[PDB]
Amino acid sequence: MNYSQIERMARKGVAFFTDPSRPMNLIKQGEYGYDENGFEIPPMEQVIPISGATRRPNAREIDGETIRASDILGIFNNDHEINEGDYIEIDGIRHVVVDARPVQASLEPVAYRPVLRRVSV
Amino acid sequence: MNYSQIERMARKGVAFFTDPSRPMNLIKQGEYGYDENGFEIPPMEQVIPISGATRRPNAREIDGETIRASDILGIFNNDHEINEGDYIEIDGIRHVVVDARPVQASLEPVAYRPVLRRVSV
Amino acid sequence: IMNQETLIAAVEQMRKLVPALRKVPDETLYAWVEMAELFVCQKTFKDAYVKAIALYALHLAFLDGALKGEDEDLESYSRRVTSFSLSGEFSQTFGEVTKNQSGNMMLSTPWGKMFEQLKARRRGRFALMTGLR
Amino acid sequence: IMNQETLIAAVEQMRKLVPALRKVPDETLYAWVEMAELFVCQKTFKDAYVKAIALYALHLAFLDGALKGEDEDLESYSRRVTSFSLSGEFSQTFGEVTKNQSGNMMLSTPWGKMFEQLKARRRGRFALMTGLR
Amino acid sequence: IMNQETLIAAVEQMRKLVPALRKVPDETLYAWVEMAELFVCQKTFKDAYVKAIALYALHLAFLDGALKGEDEDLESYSRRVTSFSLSGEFSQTFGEVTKNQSGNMMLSTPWGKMFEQLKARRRGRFALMTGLR
Amino acid sequence: IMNQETLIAAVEQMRKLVPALRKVPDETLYAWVEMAELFVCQKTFKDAYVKAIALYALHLAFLDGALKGEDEDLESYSRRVTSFSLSGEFSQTFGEVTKNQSGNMMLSTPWGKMFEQLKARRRGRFALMTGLR
Amino acid sequence: IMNQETLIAAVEQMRKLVPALRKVPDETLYAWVEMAELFVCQKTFKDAYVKAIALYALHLAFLDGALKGEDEDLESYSRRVTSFSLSGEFSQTFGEVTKNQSGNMMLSTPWGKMFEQLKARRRGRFALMTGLR
Numbered sequence: 001m002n003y004s005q006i007e008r009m010a011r012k013g014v015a016f017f018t019d020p021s022r023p024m025n026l027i028k029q030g031e032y033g034y035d036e037n038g039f040e041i042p043p044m045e046q047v048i049p050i051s052g053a054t055r056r057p058n059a060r061e062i063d064g065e066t067i068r069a070s071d072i073l074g075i076f077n078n079d080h081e082i083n084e085g086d087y088i089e090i091d092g093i094r095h096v097v098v099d100a101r102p103v104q105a106s107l108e109p110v111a112y113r114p115v116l117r118r119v120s121v
Numbered sequence: 122m123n124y125s126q127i128e129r130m131a132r133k134g135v136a137f138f139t140d141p142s143r144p145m146n147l148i149k150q151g152e153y154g155y156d157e158n159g160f161e162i163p164p165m166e167q168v169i170p171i172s173g174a175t176r177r178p179n180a181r182e183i184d185g186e187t188i189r190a191s192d193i194l195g196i197f198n199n200d201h202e203i204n205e206g207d208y209i210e211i212d213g214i215r216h217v218v219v220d221a222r223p224v225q226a227s228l229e230p231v232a233y234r235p236v237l238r239r240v241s242v
Numbered sequence: 243i244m245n246q247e248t249l250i251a252a253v254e255q256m257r258k259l260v261p262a263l264r265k266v267p268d269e270t271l272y273a274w275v276e277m278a279e280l281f282v283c284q285k286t287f288k289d290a291y292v293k294a295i296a297l298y299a300l301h302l303a304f305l306d307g308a309l310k311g312e313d314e315d316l317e318s319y320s321r322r323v324t325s326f327s328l329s330g331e332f333s334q335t336f337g338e339v340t341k342n343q344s345g346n347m348m349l350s351t352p353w354g355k356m357f358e359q360l361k362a363r364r365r366g367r368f369a370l371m372t373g374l375r
Numbered sequence: 376i377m378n379q380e381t382l383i384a385a386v387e388q389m390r391k392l393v394p395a396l397r398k399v400p401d402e403t404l405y406a407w408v409e410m411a412e413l414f415v416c417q418k419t420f421k422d423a424y425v426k427a428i429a430l431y432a433l434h435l436a437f438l439d440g441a442l443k444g445e446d447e448d449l450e451s452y453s454r455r456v457t458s459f460s461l462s463g464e465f466s467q468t469f470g471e472v473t474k475n476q477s478g479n480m481m482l483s484t485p486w487g488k489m490f491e492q493l494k495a496r497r498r499g500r501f502a503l504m505t506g507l508r
Numbered sequence: 509i510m511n512q513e514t515l516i517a518a519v520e521q522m523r524k525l526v527p528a529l530r531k532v533p534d535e536t537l538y539a540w541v542e543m544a545e546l547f548v549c550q551k552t553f554k555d556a557y558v559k560a561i562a563l564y565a566l567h568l569a570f571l572d573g574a575l576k577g578e579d580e581d582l583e584s585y586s587r588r589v590t591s592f593s594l595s596g597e598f599s600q601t602f603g604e605v606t607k608n609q610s611g612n613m614m615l616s617t618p619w620g621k622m623f624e625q626l627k628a629r630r631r632g633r634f635a636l637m638t639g640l641r
Numbered sequence: 642i643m644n645q646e647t648l649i650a651a652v653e654q655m656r657k658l659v660p661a662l663r664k665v666p667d668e669t670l671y672a673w674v675e676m677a678e679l680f681v682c683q684k685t686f687k688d689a690y691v692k693a694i695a696l697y698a699l700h701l702a703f704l705d706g707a708l709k710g711e712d713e714d715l716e717s718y719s720r721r722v723t724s725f726s727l728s729g730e731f732s733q734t735f736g737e738v739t740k741n742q743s744g745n746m747m748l749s750t751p752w753g754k755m756f757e758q759l760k761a762r763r764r765g766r767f768a769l770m771t772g773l774r
Numbered sequence: 775i776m777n778q779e780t781l782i783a784a785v786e787q788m789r790k791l792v793p794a795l796r797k798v799p800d801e802t803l804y805a806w807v808e809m810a811e812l813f814v815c816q817k818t819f820k821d822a823y824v825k826a827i828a829l830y831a832l833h834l835a836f837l838d839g840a841l842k843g844e845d846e847d848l849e850s851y852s853r854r855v856t857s858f859s860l861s862g863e864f865s866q867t868f869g870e871v872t873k874n875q876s877g878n879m880m881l882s883t884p885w886g887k888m889f890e891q892l893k894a895r896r897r898g899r900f901a902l903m904t905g906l907r
Contacts (some may be wrong), residue, residue: 001858002711002714002716005714005716005717006864009725009865009866010727013725013727013731013733016592016731017122017226018226018227019226019227021227021228022227053226054225055226055596055730057221057222058222059205059220059221059222059236061219064204068204070205070221075834077728080206091187091228103727103864104863105860111727113728120610123317125315126317126318127598129313129314130323130326131328134326134328137332137459167308174332176462176463177332177462177463207495216523224598225597234329234331256563258402258403258406260452261444262405262443262448262449262452263444265449266449269524273524273525275568280556280626281626281629293410295411300571304452305621306605306606306618307453307605308526308618309449310450310528311449312528316528316577318569319437319526319528319570320572321588321602321603321604322602322603322605323600323601324602324603325591325600325601326600327597327598327600328597328598329596329598331461332460332461333460334456334458335456335457335458335459336456336457337454337456337457338454338455339439339440339453339454342485344478345609345610347615349478349480353441353478354436355438359414359480363413365637535657536660539657539658546762547758547759547762548760562748571754571755572738572739572751574751576660576661579660580660581661582661582662582664582665582710583706583709585661585703586703586705586738587721587737588735588737589733589736590734590735591733591734591737592731592732592734593732593733594730594731595730595731611743613748613754623768669793670787672791674788676791678845679825679848679892679895680891699859704884704887705839705883706871707792709794710794711796715794715795716839717794718794719838719839719871720869720870720871721868722866722868723867723869724866725866726864726865726866728863728864729862742875744818744876772835
């Protein structure tokens with residue numbers, strides 16, 4: 001079976017349920033390393049734009065301390081591959097990609113369905 | 122896809138299953154801050170009217186102490202955006218919006234589906 | 243149209259038949275009635291002219307949905323929505339109200355049928371003619 | 376103008392025949408009766424004028440849901456609601472009462488069928504004509 | 509070129525009859541009116557030229573969704589979307605407004621039916637011809 | 642084709658009717674219009690020739706889907722997709738836009754119907770001939 | 775053998791009309807063009823031979839999915855796949871583009887319909903014969 005046709009269908013479907021006014025960025029900080037004593041920071045941010053769709057909002061409850069946090073799920077495109085420790089800048093709010101969950105039956109996955117949790121607590 | 126049409130459909134649907142005789146208000150108390158020793162109260166109430174629909178009543182059971190509390194779920198409109206710590210005045214009874222849960226695939230959500238729990242216990 | 247009080251009477255009669263038009267802006271009703279006046283004959287009725295104008299305007303404004311107001315997009319004029327649901331909160335389903343297999347274009351709304359009956363009672367639905375000289 | 380006492384009797388007869396009309400304001404019923412007066416013929420059945428004029432007005436009111444509430448929203452005059460349902464509270468499904476087979480618009484409601492039966496008995500449904508010479 | 513003031517009046521009449529066209533840029537409406545000018549005949553109904561030319565332009569614009577948005581993607585001019593749904597947020601189903609029974613392309617939209625009624629009243633739908641000798 | 646400015650005018654008119662072609666590469670539109678020029682008669686219209694060329698090209702480019710662009714495989718030219726869903730995230734369903742039981746091949750798109758109407762108004766849809774000498 | 779430059783022009787025209795054929799090796803396209811040469815008549819439309827021979831070759835290639843890939847498995851030439859779906863990843867459903875109503879095999883693809891229109895315009899679809907005496 002042809003996977004290019006599936007890629008085109010997935011791209012058009014993602015472009016259907018999307019709004020071209022939500023600012024979404026992506027952070028790929030990496031290449032860390034410790035000093036000869038243990039003092040160093042990763043000097044990479046690598047902010048790039050991205051667009052997609054979101055669904056299923058959910059609220060965070062920890063101890064009844066009224067922290068008022070939330071987390072959602074998203075659907076994205078194949079370019080700018082997502083990893084297991086990246087950050088997503090959704091409407092000025094950072095989320096961490098806990099799960100990548102590519103929609104994959106072949107190499108070079110057609111799309112990604114990451115699971116995002118709000119950063120900090 | 123057009124989201125204005127979805128907004129109109131959601132507004133008409135909410136206006137269908139609603140009763141224009143239930144008094145419903147909304148409280149947006151905010152802008153707190155402590156004194157130079159720690160004595161101050163938030164001087165804001167911001168009571169505004171609102172209308173919507175409710176569903177799925179549920180009862181509260183804690184210890185068998187016969188407190189007789191209850192909590193429900195609601196569906197509302199896009200104006201007067203709901204937050205994660207607001208109060209809803211349903212028929213003279215206060216409820217706290219634990220979860221916002223907007224029905225969102227785009228900015229400026231078309232509607233909200235908050236989860237309400239009765240205030241106090 | 244020839245003067246104003248007939249327009250006022252026609253609009254008042256339309257609002258009296260359907261109270262839902264008490265909220266519609268007045269200028270739109272004026273435009274609709276003065277455009278529907280082109281199809282009705284004054285010499286035929288000559289006693290219930292305002293009633294005929296009101297019935298024809300009401301029928302003309304409700305064929306397939308034309309008086310939709312403002313903020314309704316352009317796709318609503320070519321396709322109809324049959325179902326809409328919001329998550330697992332509620333659902334709704336719509337459908338057509340009248341079947342018009344005859345294809346007269348006047349037996350599509352009750353107002354059109356009433357206008358046809360009134361015309362048949364007043365003058366008739368026939369057209370019998372012969373050549374001149 | 377048609378006689379006031381006859382109009383009062385016709386409206387009151389309409390009210391007794393359909394008790395659900397007791398909650399409707401009198402001006403709308405008066406308007407419907409005056410509109411229905413244009414079709415009912417007087418000398419055909421002069422003895423029972425009130426009964427049949429009330430029947431014809433009732434047929435006009437319930438033709439295809441022509442008579443709605445005062446606060447009924449627009450866009451429901453061209454589209455009907457087949458069904459609706461809330462999440463876990465209730466659900467309902469509607470449908471049409473009967474289906475026509477002749478396209479007469481008169482054998483579409485029970486009141487219209489009663490009126491046709493009365494007209495056939497009292498005078499008849501026939502029409503024979505000849506020229507004037 | 510057709511008279512500028514007449515074109516302005518026709519476009520403004522189109523805007524008032526369908527308020528949803530107020531958000532469309534004027535050049536596209538001008539192009540549609542100029543295209544519709546090629547079919548409407550002048551001397552037939554010279555008194556009411558503007559109304560019927562606006563009606564015919566409206567019929568052309570809403571024939572089968574010929575008029576789309578500026579940024580509407582291609583491949584939607586040959587394929588329609590019956591329904592769509594997100595996971596647990598919303599769902600919707602569409603459908604066709606009415607169904608033709610004659611294949612005239614003119615009894616397909618309400619505006620076309622209005623135009624045919626106006627043409628039949630003003631001049632007629634007939635055509636009788638004989639040779640020139 | 643005989644010269645260039647007519648080609649420019651035709652392409653500009655096609656882009657004016659459908660703004661979605663402002664993104665299509667120019668050479669493809671040139672090829673489509675110069676291949677659709679083979680079916681239209683210049684002597685027949687002789688006043689709205691560019692409009693006829695634009696309408697015929699638009700109709701010819703939209704019969705069953707021919708202007709699909711690049712990177713679309715070869716199976717898309719023999720079968721159509723009616724549904725597509727992605728896990729439990731979203732779903733979508735497509736369908737045909739027009740039924741053409743007549744089989745004229747010109748009443749398949751609105752552009753074809755408009756071209757037929759324009760040809761009927763200009764010259765006619767008949768072909769009456771007799772043998773020579 | 776048919777002229778080499780004409781074959782090159784026909785293949786290149788096929789490539790520009792359908793951009794998706796740019797990825798197909800030239801030998802297969804040459805074979806298809808040579809096969810389609812056996813049906814196209816030369817003296818009928820000598821001016822536009824290349825366009826119509828390319829059209830007929832395109833119609834032959836997309837008749838019923840006759841042209842498949844190099845590594846396409848057998849048993850798919852007699853059986854088609856209506857739908858498929860993985861467990862929780864994706865699903866898809868296919869269908870036929872259009873449905874024939876005459877059994878001519880020529881009004882089955884858009885390219886064949888274009889070719890028939892061109893043949894009817896240039897020469898005609900008629901055939902009148904008499905004996906030789």
